[PDB]
């Protein structure tokens, strides 16, 4: 560790802890920048040399974290919890969490190499027939193809190509991660991840939320299953069993927006999937980001700085260079460089992804002047909700008309059901998946799910919550959890379940602040500087204050609450209930053992 980055001496009191955090801040930004920069160089250009530089940068970050983390303990272990400054407590509490820096050098290098290799495997995996990449090739097949056998080839090809080689690495990562955080006092890594929500009843609170939401999913599921049955037939769709996991428009069946055309209740109304209009009009990635930016500035939030436009990767490179295509938003911790890395495609759902990622950036811009340790969301779910809240306004037929994507504008009950059904395919359908992913990982980290049950327990949860089944037989050689980005990239997932609930609480509060007095699902906060000011207060707080208090200041309640989401979807919740009853649907999937047969000539005819 360079001398300038090493901790000096500070008094063993709160006045020295303050000077300690100031000196930490000075060197942490440099260490974070070199680490983020090296990660950027690798993720925008996957080479072996760039992976080596990233592992060396990660090793330096661990060296920094060890020195300052061990100094923080040395000086402040028994007095930091009593400091009068609540932000200083949060800073000290963060610095003294060493994580992977607890591992001995050899195991630090193992750990860093595992993260690098898992990242490379996921983002370079391909399905060969010439070969297809996940983004865009297989993504487009899952989204547009309606051939049961073709969707099967892409689904099976991807899960096999990405998951199988990851499993031995993921086992090793899990053990090292647990070893590291056990030295921080946590029973396992999952316990550390859950501690970010500072709620002793976190898992019970989540279970109570899902109990309120599950009936909406069950009715959406039964309605969609009927629509798929009408297209694929009784051989491939069981009206009393789980839906084959490759037929819902998305590689992970986590968003069903892509099958909207098969489920739209009233096709004679305006087409709310504006993808075809974006293409007809010649939209490109840069247009999508500028339209997103202008919504932010309409609220008097910040535009994207020049450093963002000059540094970001907004399309997949056409030099064929290997990149991490999964969309992400980057804080370089130098208060100047902020970037998005996205292999953007011209679709409506990608426009929503752009808003999601730009919401991450807006957070970074608003709290860039806080101490590095507090440059986070009030909790991780806050960070995930910002852009989605704006996208809720953008997707309204009224707003789409304003930006030229929906010429016809209608306000009738049928159009409302169409819109709420489309929104349910994006938001309700995701809820079981957003909930189950970290249930699986918490069980892996705790040891309830050993490697011998990785896939068994994954598909138990997928069926239990999503009511889907794999369309080909799986076994424990397969590692289908590993075929989902966040698992090999070690990104927690419960934040997305939290965000999908939270964003409707935000939406309701900002709509009220904007002076809107109509149906919640028709609210558009576009150009509301009052709504912008309320949102800005959240963003500028970072993690400096307990999220429960930040939430109460914003929405008037100190807890996650499903009522705004239920209120938003009320009309289609009632409509789906009635339709499924009239159609004599079985809610749920009582034939839980059912899997579809293989196509006659599979995979010969692809
Ligand atoms: C789409 O249309 C709905 C429904 O409009 C209402 O019902 C129709 C059958 C007609 O009779 C309309 O004349 C009638 O407004 C609109 O929702 C309605 O918006 C108005 C405000 O624009 C709401 O009235 C306000 O209500 C608050 C109390 O909540 C009062 O303080 C105000 O003084 C004002 O009266 C009305 O409650 C609301 N109705 C519902 C069911 O929410 C909606 O605005 C419209 N949307 C678009 C995008 O055009
Ligand atoms: C339209 C739309 C909106 C939002 C998403 C979000 C929610 C679902 C989840 C998913 O698609 O499963 N999702 C992402 O994954 C996005 N991308 C990660 C990247 C997080 C990351 C952290 C650290 C390092 C690298 C990446 C991020 O922005 O939160 C999807 C689609
Ligand atoms: C991808 O990364 C490699 C580094 O691993 C880059 O290769 C360097 O390119 C510069 C030219 O600007 C040369 O001077 C270096 O000698 C190269 N280094 C190595 C190890 O080959 C490459 O330029 C990157 N590609 C892009 C498009 O940025
Ligand atoms: C696991 O699965 C591997 C390949 O998948 C198999 O392919 C088709 C033909 C069916 O046999 C299906 O049931 C299988 O999933 C096999 O190579 C492997 O031997 C299977 N079992 C084990 C223990 O690895
Ligand atoms: Cl999280
Ligand atoms: Mg789509
Ligand atoms: Zn996000």
XYZ file of C-alpha atoms and ligand atoms in Angstrom:
741
model
C 0.000 0.000 0.000
C 1.489 3.314 -1.088
C 2.492 5.447 1.939
C 0.029 8.190 0.985
C -2.820 5.665 1.245
C -1.857 4.248 4.669
C -3.678 5.254 7.875
C -1.740 7.508 10.220
C -2.488 7.919 13.905
C -5.703 9.363 15.309
C -7.031 9.806 18.822
C -9.121 6.995 20.314
C -12.261 9.140 20.493
C -14.975 10.634 18.300
C -12.923 13.736 17.467
C -10.197 11.491 16.063
C -12.684 9.224 14.307
C -13.869 12.331 12.445
C -10.334 13.148 11.308
C -9.981 9.415 10.610
C -12.939 9.449 8.218
C -11.629 12.606 6.521
C -8.223 11.055 5.839
C -9.965 7.825 4.812
C -12.172 9.761 2.378
C -9.096 11.279 0.729
C -7.435 7.947 -0.048
C -10.584 5.856 -0.526
C -11.621 7.836 -3.614
C -8.288 7.092 -5.291
C -8.470 3.400 -4.375
C -12.099 3.161 -5.477
C -11.422 4.978 -8.756
C -8.552 2.688 -9.769
C -10.716 -0.318 -8.896
C -13.789 0.941 -10.756
C -11.632 2.060 -13.687
C -9.986 -1.363 -13.939
C -13.403 -3.024 -13.738
C -14.628 -0.688 -16.484
C -11.645 -1.505 -18.701
C -12.408 -5.209 -18.280
C -16.193 -5.034 -18.605
C -15.972 -2.923 -21.800
C -13.219 -5.142 -23.255
C -12.981 -8.666 -21.822
C -9.334 -9.682 -22.235
C -7.026 -11.768 -20.085
C -4.730 -8.773 -19.567
C -7.617 -6.567 -18.430
C -8.747 -9.271 -15.996
C -5.220 -9.357 -14.562
C -5.224 -5.587 -14.029
C -8.659 -5.771 -12.397
C -7.540 -8.482 -9.968
C -4.480 -6.430 -9.012
C -6.719 -3.411 -8.422
C -9.086 -5.549 -6.353
C -6.098 -6.788 -4.350
C -5.006 -3.208 -3.657
C -8.544 -2.350 -2.523
C -8.406 -5.282 -0.095
C -5.010 -4.091 1.138
C -6.484 -0.630 1.694
C -9.590 -2.042 3.381
C -7.466 -4.210 5.688
C -5.209 -1.370 6.820
C -7.996 1.134 7.456
C -10.373 -1.547 8.708
C -7.802 -2.840 11.185
C -6.920 0.708 12.244
C -10.618 1.491 12.697
C -10.951 -1.503 15.022
C -7.663 -0.763 16.792
C -8.793 2.762 17.700
C -12.588 2.639 17.866
C -13.869 -0.909 18.421
C -15.573 -0.268 21.820
C -16.632 3.388 21.379
C -17.785 3.757 17.776
C -21.314 2.528 18.525
C -21.757 5.387 21.037
C -20.517 8.261 18.846
C -22.795 11.291 18.908
C -22.478 11.770 15.135
C -24.851 9.277 13.463
C -23.195 9.666 10.053
C -19.773 9.027 11.592
C -21.114 5.806 13.118
C -22.319 4.744 9.671
C -18.914 5.607 8.192
C -16.933 3.808 10.901
C -19.316 0.858 10.810
C -18.635 0.511 7.087
C -14.847 0.890 7.261
C -14.543 -1.779 9.960
C -16.384 -4.341 7.794
C -13.447 -5.987 6.026
C -15.279 -8.594 3.964
C -12.928 -10.338 1.557
C -10.076 -8.327 3.095
C -10.315 -10.750 6.032
C -9.006 -13.547 3.816
C -5.272 -14.307 3.810
C -3.435 -13.122 0.713
C -3.539 -16.460 -1.115
C -7.291 -16.729 -0.554
C -7.820 -13.086 -1.538
C -6.186 -13.907 -4.869
C -8.315 -17.047 -5.222
C -11.439 -15.027 -4.425
C -10.607 -12.258 -6.898
C -9.749 -14.779 -9.611
C -13.038 -16.610 -9.039
C -15.069 -13.421 -9.453
C -13.147 -12.631 -12.645
C -13.554 -16.107 -14.144
C -17.251 -16.295 -13.254
C -17.810 -12.898 -14.873
C -15.946 -13.968 -18.013
C -17.835 -17.259 -18.311
C -21.265 -15.647 -18.072
C -20.622 -12.736 -20.427
C -18.759 -14.726 -23.110
C -20.952 -17.841 -23.140
C -22.475 -18.610 -26.527
C -24.946 -21.029 -28.089
C -23.680 -22.629 -31.292
C -25.834 -24.114 -34.032
C -21.769 -19.801 -36.171
C -22.909 -19.048 -32.617
C -25.475 -16.889 -30.827
C -24.733 -14.572 -27.917
C -27.171 -13.887 -25.096
C -27.453 -10.208 -26.064
C -28.903 -9.662 -28.693
C -29.246 -13.062 -30.385
C -30.851 -15.274 -27.732
C -32.676 -12.344 -26.132
C -34.404 -11.689 -29.459
C -35.349 -15.358 -29.906
C -36.960 -15.565 -26.463
C -38.769 -12.284 -27.162
C -40.025 -12.739 -30.738
C -39.916 -16.427 -31.657
C -43.130 -18.405 -31.225
C -41.702 -21.789 -32.272
C -41.800 -24.055 -29.233
C -38.809 -25.993 -30.571
C -36.759 -22.876 -31.359
C -37.423 -21.254 -27.987
C -36.377 -24.567 -26.450
C -33.088 -24.583 -28.364
C -32.244 -21.087 -27.112
C -33.383 -21.725 -23.528
C -31.575 -25.055 -23.174
C -28.522 -23.847 -25.074
C -28.106 -20.805 -22.841
C -28.668 -22.529 -19.506
C -26.257 -25.323 -20.451
C -23.570 -23.031 -21.881
C -23.530 -20.560 -18.981
C -24.550 -22.637 -15.962
C -22.641 -25.904 -16.262
C -19.093 -24.427 -16.284
C -19.905 -22.007 -13.445
C -20.894 -24.570 -10.823
C -17.459 -25.611 -9.467
C -16.369 -21.966 -9.342
C -19.546 -20.911 -7.552
C -19.062 -23.577 -4.883
C -15.542 -22.295 -4.228
C -16.684 -18.663 -4.196
C -19.421 -19.434 -1.673
C -17.000 -21.042 0.770
C -14.490 -18.191 0.537
C -17.181 -15.521 0.831
C -18.565 -17.171 3.963
C -15.067 -17.535 5.421
C -14.466 -13.816 4.862
C -17.696 -12.490 6.378
C -17.678 -14.961 9.266
C -14.654 -12.929 10.399
C -16.873 -9.824 10.324
C -19.208 -11.563 12.798
C -21.899 -12.794 10.390
C -23.102 -16.389 10.363
C -22.805 -16.371 6.554
C -22.672 -13.994 3.601
C -26.457 -13.873 3.275
C -26.755 -12.592 6.835
C -24.398 -9.771 5.883
C -26.424 -8.951 2.761
C -29.657 -8.864 4.760
C -28.090 -6.600 7.402
C -28.160 -3.680 4.939
C -31.896 -3.342 5.589
C -31.380 -2.938 9.362
C -34.612 -4.733 10.196
C -34.625 -7.708 12.611
C -37.883 -8.904 10.984
C -36.742 -8.549 7.363
C -37.598 -12.029 6.090
C -40.966 -12.137 7.869
C -41.813 -8.656 6.579
C -41.001 -9.794 3.033
C -43.111 -12.933 3.428
C -46.049 -10.821 4.613
C -45.696 -8.565 1.567
C -45.641 -11.512 -0.808
C -48.765 -12.993 0.796
C -50.594 -9.807 -0.212
C -49.224 -9.893 -3.762
C -49.462 -13.602 -4.595
C -53.183 -13.584 -5.563
C -52.440 -10.977 -8.230
C -49.691 -13.164 -9.660
C -51.824 -16.311 -9.546
C -54.587 -14.648 -11.560
C -52.155 -13.114 -14.046
C -50.475 -16.520 -14.365
C -53.731 -18.376 -15.038
C -54.851 -15.807 -17.617
C -51.527 -15.927 -19.479
C -51.423 -19.736 -19.303
C -54.822 -19.820 -21.030
C -53.515 -17.493 -23.748
C -50.474 -19.715 -24.308
C -52.693 -22.806 -24.394
C -54.698 -21.286 -27.246
C -51.466 -20.910 -29.269
C -49.299 -23.901 -28.323
C -52.034 -26.459 -27.631
C -52.765 -29.034 -24.957
C -49.547 -30.952 -25.674
C -47.232 -28.116 -24.583
C -49.466 -26.215 -22.118
C -51.118 -27.854 -19.105
C -54.000 -25.687 -17.897
C -53.500 -27.120 -14.386
C -49.693 -27.276 -14.373
C -46.673 -24.978 -14.459
C -45.923 -22.987 -17.603
C -42.841 -24.141 -19.561
C -40.130 -21.664 -18.614
C -39.197 -20.648 -22.186
C -42.602 -19.432 -23.422
C -42.989 -16.149 -21.507
C -40.818 -13.835 -23.625
C -37.748 -13.688 -21.380
C -34.842 -16.070 -20.792
C -35.724 -16.230 -17.074
C -39.513 -15.819 -17.393
C -39.040 -12.803 -15.114
C -40.853 -10.245 -17.292
C -43.697 -11.218 -19.623
C -43.976 -7.941 -21.568
C -42.851 -9.646 -24.785
C -45.986 -11.829 -24.989
C -48.326 -8.836 -24.605
C -49.630 -9.344 -28.148
C -50.858 -12.833 -27.204
C -52.622 -11.656 -24.033
C -53.861 -8.110 -24.811
C -57.554 -8.157 -23.803
C -58.798 -5.552 -26.328
C -56.671 -5.478 -29.506
C -58.896 -2.876 -31.221
C -57.490 -0.191 -28.892
C -54.184 1.660 -29.371
C -51.149 -0.627 -29.451
C -49.371 0.120 -26.176
C -46.144 -1.656 -27.191
C -44.491 1.218 -29.039
C -41.440 -0.802 -30.100
C -42.661 -0.940 -33.703
C -43.124 2.837 -33.684
C -39.634 3.425 -32.266
C -38.260 1.345 -35.142
C -40.452 2.994 -37.779
C -39.272 6.381 -36.469
C -35.593 5.408 -36.447
C -34.892 5.607 -32.726
C -31.328 4.752 -31.721
C -29.583 4.293 -28.387
C -28.529 7.936 -28.119
C -32.126 9.078 -28.658
C -33.351 6.799 -25.883
C -30.813 8.166 -23.398
C -31.536 11.787 -24.336
C -35.280 11.271 -23.913
C -34.638 9.719 -20.503
C -32.352 12.606 -19.547
C -34.943 15.201 -20.509
C -37.492 13.646 -18.144
C -34.976 14.059 -15.321
C -34.286 17.673 -16.267
C -38.035 18.347 -16.575
C -38.156 17.631 -12.832
C -35.207 20.021 -12.299
C -32.909 17.100 -11.576
C -29.437 17.075 -13.078
C -28.638 16.400 -16.746
C -26.004 13.825 -17.582
C -22.561 15.495 -17.408
C -20.212 15.587 -20.413
C -18.099 12.884 -18.779
C -21.147 10.606 -19.029
C -21.638 11.083 -22.766
C -17.916 10.881 -23.541
C -17.213 7.777 -21.451
C -20.341 5.635 -21.580
C -20.827 2.534 -23.733
C -24.410 2.811 -24.992
C -24.318 0.206 -27.787
C -22.671 -3.164 -28.198
C -19.298 -2.565 -29.915
C -19.209 -3.638 -33.557
C -15.484 -4.359 -33.605
C -16.673 -7.688 -32.146
C -14.817 -6.938 -28.909
C -16.049 -8.993 -25.952
C -18.036 -6.940 -23.421
C -20.303 -7.395 -20.426
C -23.590 -6.497 -22.097
C -25.799 -6.594 -18.997
C -26.857 -3.014 -18.326
C -25.201 -1.218 -15.419
C -24.593 2.279 -14.047
C -21.148 3.210 -12.772
C -19.935 5.550 -10.038
C -16.171 6.088 -10.284
C -16.084 7.782 -6.840
C -14.139 10.812 -8.112
C -17.258 13.054 -8.229
C -16.678 13.548 -11.974
C -16.959 10.271 -13.906
C -20.335 8.518 -14.140
C -21.186 6.101 -16.929
C -23.692 3.567 -18.187
C -22.578 0.378 -19.942
C -25.499 -1.067 -21.903
C -25.801 -3.031 -25.153
C -28.907 -1.000 -25.843
C -31.514 -2.339 -28.264
C -34.345 -0.246 -29.718
C -37.359 -1.583 -27.814
C -39.852 -0.222 -25.312
C -38.521 -2.434 -22.518
C -35.013 -1.183 -23.298
C -36.283 2.377 -22.958
C -37.426 1.397 -19.459
C -34.008 -0.149 -18.791
C -32.389 3.142 -19.838
C -34.545 4.987 -17.298
C -33.690 2.419 -14.637
C -29.961 2.833 -15.262
C -30.202 6.614 -15.495
C -31.961 6.583 -12.129
C -28.814 4.980 -10.733
C -26.745 7.793 -12.285
C -29.023 10.518 -10.919
C -28.541 9.090 -7.423
C -24.758 9.232 -7.913
C -24.920 12.838 -9.120
C -27.048 13.931 -6.165
C -24.931 12.380 -3.381
C -21.490 12.739 -4.996
C -20.400 15.182 -2.269
C -21.204 12.925 0.685
C -18.449 10.868 2.321
C -17.646 7.863 0.137
C -19.103 5.434 2.683
C -22.505 7.170 2.492
C -22.643 7.211 -1.329
C -25.325 4.528 -1.402
C -29.082 4.330 -1.451
C -30.985 4.622 1.804
C -31.140 0.898 1.216
C -30.318 -1.013 -1.997
C -34.011 -1.067 -2.920
C -34.117 2.738 -3.025
C -31.346 2.784 -5.624
C -33.258 0.284 -7.759
C -36.555 2.193 -7.578
C -35.516 5.672 -8.750
C -35.525 5.141 -12.509
C -38.481 2.756 -12.415
C -40.622 5.458 -10.778
C -39.977 7.848 -13.656
C -40.571 5.027 -16.133
C -44.010 4.528 -14.574
C -44.921 8.008 -15.811
C -43.195 7.563 -19.170
C -45.150 4.408 -20.025
C -48.573 6.027 -19.576
C -50.458 6.388 -22.890
C -50.737 10.120 -22.208
C -46.978 10.554 -21.878
C -46.206 8.302 -24.841
C -48.447 10.598 -26.875
C -46.489 13.645 -25.679
C -43.201 12.181 -26.950
C -44.631 11.075 -30.302
C -44.825 7.313 -29.667
C -48.630 6.904 -29.535
C -50.670 9.059 -31.911
C -54.065 7.744 -30.801
C -55.073 8.666 -27.250
C -58.089 7.120 -25.515
C -59.549 7.202 -21.982
C -61.956 4.272 -21.636
C -62.202 1.180 -19.465
C -60.925 -1.202 -22.151
C -57.830 0.925 -22.762
C -57.217 1.015 -19.002
C -57.369 -2.781 -18.755
C -54.970 -3.098 -21.699
C -52.513 -0.731 -20.026
C -52.739 -2.287 -16.566
C -52.386 -5.767 -18.059
C -49.252 -4.697 -19.931
C -47.879 -3.152 -16.739
C -48.736 -6.331 -14.807
C -46.738 -8.414 -17.299
C -43.736 -6.236 -16.420
C -44.279 -5.675 -12.684
C -46.518 -8.388 -11.212
C -44.933 -11.238 -13.175
C -41.527 -10.222 -11.803
C -42.524 -10.336 -8.120
C -42.113 -14.116 -7.553
C -38.744 -14.066 -9.317
C -37.521 -10.990 -7.458
C -38.469 -12.764 -4.232
C -37.069 -16.239 -4.900
C -33.558 -15.547 -6.214
C -32.040 -14.607 -2.859
C -34.120 -17.192 -1.036
C -32.072 -19.621 -3.116
C -28.795 -17.812 -2.443
C -29.493 -17.332 1.266
C -29.940 -21.101 1.459
C -26.686 -21.667 -0.405
C -24.783 -19.265 1.852
C -26.288 -20.772 5.002
C -25.533 -24.329 3.893
C -29.166 -25.452 3.707
C -28.591 -25.882 -0.053
C -25.278 -27.689 -0.626
C -23.841 -28.081 -4.136
C -25.632 -31.450 -4.345
C -28.988 -29.588 -4.350
C -28.165 -26.364 -6.235
C -30.533 -27.132 -9.114
C -33.044 -29.185 -7.121
C -33.617 -26.231 -4.799
C -33.495 -23.669 -7.615
C -36.315 -25.383 -9.487
C -38.235 -26.057 -6.283
C -38.367 -22.287 -5.789
C -39.025 -21.507 -9.455
C -42.063 -23.793 -9.431
C -43.220 -22.795 -5.938
C -43.229 -19.070 -6.721
C -43.330 -18.599 -10.494
C -45.319 -21.702 -11.394
C -42.955 -22.571 -14.240
C -41.131 -25.776 -15.133
C -38.006 -26.443 -17.199
C -38.937 -27.545 -20.735
C -36.164 -30.173 -20.778
C -35.123 -32.462 -17.955
C -32.508 -31.041 -15.592
C -30.149 -32.657 -13.095
C -27.402 -31.514 -10.734
C -24.846 -31.295 -13.526
C -26.918 -28.308 -14.602
C -26.559 -25.081 -12.621
C -29.452 -23.017 -13.901
C -29.141 -20.370 -11.189
C -25.722 -19.636 -12.683
C -27.340 -18.787 -16.022
C -28.751 -15.611 -14.401
C -26.338 -12.653 -14.467
C -26.549 -11.653 -10.804
C -25.418 -15.058 -9.491
C -21.938 -15.313 -11.097
C -21.579 -11.534 -10.795
C -22.416 -11.761 -7.072
C -25.065 -9.028 -7.194
C -27.792 -9.360 -4.523
C -31.357 -9.625 -5.769
C -33.824 -8.947 -2.937
C -33.330 -5.238 -3.682
C -35.460 -5.750 -6.801
C -38.387 -7.246 -4.899
C -38.137 -4.317 -2.478
C -37.928 -1.837 -5.358
C -40.922 -3.226 -7.245
C -43.028 -2.597 -4.135
C -41.278 0.631 -3.161
C -41.579 2.273 -6.568
C -45.370 2.388 -6.279
C -45.093 3.983 -2.836
C -42.803 6.585 -4.422
C -45.141 6.988 -7.409
C -48.162 7.643 -5.192
C -46.259 10.212 -3.113
C -44.762 12.077 -6.078
C -48.103 12.107 -7.883
C -49.774 13.629 -4.828
C -46.919 16.134 -4.541
C -47.375 16.992 -8.226
C -51.008 17.926 -7.580
C -52.354 15.010 -9.615
C -55.908 14.023 -8.664
C -56.829 11.241 -11.093
C -56.330 7.472 -11.171
C -52.904 6.529 -9.864
C -52.089 4.527 -13.002
C -52.690 7.564 -15.258
C -50.388 9.892 -13.303
C -47.496 11.516 -15.186
C -45.129 13.605 -13.043
C -43.390 14.956 -16.156
C -42.344 18.594 -15.620
C -43.410 18.610 -11.943
C -40.677 20.586 -10.212
C -42.423 19.932 -6.884
C -42.207 16.174 -7.431
C -38.596 16.650 -8.493
C -37.785 18.495 -5.273
C -39.296 15.731 -3.136
C -37.386 13.042 -5.030
C -34.219 15.150 -4.820
C -34.355 15.115 -1.014
C -34.228 11.308 -1.065
C -31.375 11.162 -3.563
C -29.184 13.677 -1.738
C -29.501 11.757 1.544
C -27.553 8.736 0.322
C -27.220 6.289 3.202
C -26.610 9.071 5.727
C -29.926 8.403 7.502
C -31.987 5.287 8.276
C -34.064 4.340 5.254
C -37.171 4.043 7.433
C -36.920 7.758 8.267
C -36.134 8.816 4.693
C -39.164 6.840 3.515
C -41.420 8.417 6.138
C -40.293 11.902 5.103
C -41.151 11.057 1.490
C -44.342 8.967 1.624
C -45.589 9.370 5.209
C -44.918 5.758 6.237
C -41.793 4.214 7.765
C -42.203 0.783 6.154
C -42.610 -1.040 2.877
C -46.310 -1.194 2.014
C -48.060 -3.073 -0.786
C -51.169 -0.874 -0.749
C -49.974 1.598 -3.428
C -49.166 -1.262 -5.805
C -52.542 -2.866 -5.115
C -54.276 0.487 -5.649
C -52.420 1.012 -8.932
C -53.514 -2.385 -10.306
C -56.983 -2.498 -8.689
C -58.977 -2.433 -11.937
C -57.077 -5.240 -13.667
C -56.833 -7.278 -10.466
C -60.632 -7.296 -10.363
C -60.879 -7.876 -14.116
C -58.490 -10.846 -14.117
C -60.316 -12.439 -11.176
C -63.625 -12.191 -13.037
C -62.196 -13.464 -16.328
C -60.512 -16.496 -14.769
C -63.747 -17.351 -12.946
C -65.862 -17.074 -16.096
C -63.292 -19.213 -17.930
C -63.272 -21.826 -15.157
C -59.533 -21.549 -14.588
C -57.687 -23.401 -11.864
C -55.616 -20.821 -10.016
C -52.165 -22.221 -9.388
C -50.509 -25.342 -10.747
C -51.705 -28.412 -8.818
C -50.039 -30.745 -11.356
C -46.686 -29.613 -9.996
C -44.885 -32.642 -11.476
C -45.847 -31.857 -15.059
C -43.213 -31.093 -17.681
C -43.911 -30.673 -21.404
C -42.816 -33.376 -23.849
C -39.954 -32.868 -26.246
C -40.735 -31.750 -29.804
C -40.915 -34.682 -32.201
C -37.553 -34.098 -33.899
C -35.685 -32.225 -31.202
C -33.144 -30.616 -31.826
C -32.661 -31.887 -35.374
C -34.738 -29.263 -37.167
C -33.342 -26.038 -35.696
C -59.663 9.544 -17.625
O -60.996 9.632 -17.145
C -61.087 9.493 -15.723
C -62.557 9.417 -15.384
O -63.192 10.666 -15.617
C -64.390 10.792 -14.824
O -65.354 9.829 -15.199
C -65.811 9.914 -16.561
C -66.815 8.786 -16.747
C -66.394 11.299 -16.870
O -67.589 11.490 -16.131
C -65.373 12.387 -16.507
O -66.007 13.649 -16.677
C -64.907 12.221 -15.054
O -63.924 13.200 -14.721
C -60.383 10.671 -15.066
O -60.377 10.475 -13.659
C -60.964 11.606 -12.992
O -60.136 12.764 -12.969
C -60.736 13.869 -12.274
C -59.745 15.009 -12.348
O -59.233 15.172 -13.664
C -61.095 13.488 -10.833
O -61.877 14.542 -10.282
C -61.181 15.229 -9.225
O -61.317 14.518 -8.011
C -60.740 15.145 -6.855
C -60.979 14.213 -5.678
O -60.256 13.007 -5.901
C -61.388 16.529 -6.651
O -60.735 17.205 -5.587
C -61.290 17.376 -7.927
O -61.992 18.603 -7.745
C -61.807 16.621 -9.148
O -63.215 16.507 -9.003
C -61.885 12.185 -10.773
O -62.007 11.752 -9.423
C -61.174 11.115 -11.584
N -61.915 9.864 -11.584
C -61.371 8.702 -11.204
C -62.255 7.498 -11.306
O -60.218 8.628 -10.792
C -58.938 10.759 -15.531
O -58.369 11.979 -15.069
C -58.825 10.701 -17.055
N -57.430 10.547 -17.433
C -56.891 11.090 -18.526
C -55.432 10.814 -18.739
O -57.548 11.767 -19.309
C -36.579 -2.611 -17.797
C -35.755 -3.175 -16.638
C -35.571 -2.395 -15.510
C -34.835 -2.885 -14.449
C -34.261 -4.147 -14.506
C -33.549 -4.569 -13.349
C -34.634 -5.204 -12.402
C -34.595 -6.520 -12.679
C -33.017 -6.817 -12.949
C -32.841 -7.962 -13.942
O -32.759 -7.722 -15.182
O -32.762 -9.148 -13.517
N -32.494 -5.698 -13.450
C -31.104 -5.624 -13.923
O -30.435 -6.603 -13.879
C -30.528 -4.320 -14.472
N -29.050 -4.323 -14.360
C -28.618 -4.275 -12.964
C -27.091 -4.342 -12.894
C -26.586 -4.408 -11.428
C -25.048 -4.568 -11.303
C -24.451 -4.372 -10.067
C -23.079 -4.511 -9.931
C -22.304 -4.854 -11.027
C -22.900 -5.054 -12.260
C -24.274 -4.909 -12.399
C -29.074 -2.975 -12.325
O -28.942 -1.882 -12.949
O -29.582 -3.002 -11.173
C -34.459 -4.941 -15.631
C -35.201 -4.445 -16.701
C -8.721 -3.909 -25.211
O -7.743 -4.099 -24.183
C -6.375 -4.225 -24.608
C -5.553 -4.319 -23.343
O -5.632 -5.610 -22.754
C -5.950 -3.040 -25.475
O -4.696 -3.360 -26.069
C -3.756 -2.268 -26.016
O -3.940 -1.337 -27.089
C -3.017 -0.238 -27.062
C -3.417 0.700 -28.178
O -4.083 1.849 -27.674
C -1.590 -0.759 -27.200
O -0.679 0.332 -27.120
C -1.297 -1.766 -26.097
O -0.010 -2.342 -26.294
C -2.351 -2.871 -26.092
N -2.121 -3.791 -24.990
C -2.226 -5.118 -25.112
C -1.957 -5.914 -23.871
O -2.525 -5.652 -26.176
C -6.960 -2.764 -26.580
O -6.637 -1.535 -27.222
C -8.375 -2.661 -26.022
N -9.320 -2.435 -27.103
C -10.099 -1.351 -27.179
C -10.986 -1.264 -28.384
O -10.092 -0.482 -26.311
C -27.574 -34.939 -16.676
O -27.924 -34.479 -18.009
C -26.885 -34.643 -18.999
C -27.474 -34.216 -20.324
O -28.869 -33.970 -20.220
C -29.580 -35.187 -20.526
O -30.026 -35.122 -21.887
C -31.231 -35.808 -22.316
C -30.833 -36.680 -23.504
C -31.904 -36.603 -21.207
O -31.133 -37.749 -20.879
C -32.061 -35.713 -19.991
O -32.786 -36.456 -19.011
C -30.691 -35.319 -19.433
O -30.795 -34.138 -18.639
C -26.360 -36.083 -19.039
O -25.249 -36.171 -19.923
C -25.969 -36.549 -17.644
O -25.526 -37.901 -17.673
C -27.176 -36.397 -16.739
N -26.942 -36.967 -15.422
C -25.879 -36.706 -14.656
C -25.851 -37.402 -13.328
O -24.989 -35.941 -15.009
Cl -29.904 -6.032 -1.607
Mg -40.038 -6.383 -25.666
Zn -30.488 -1.265 -10.917
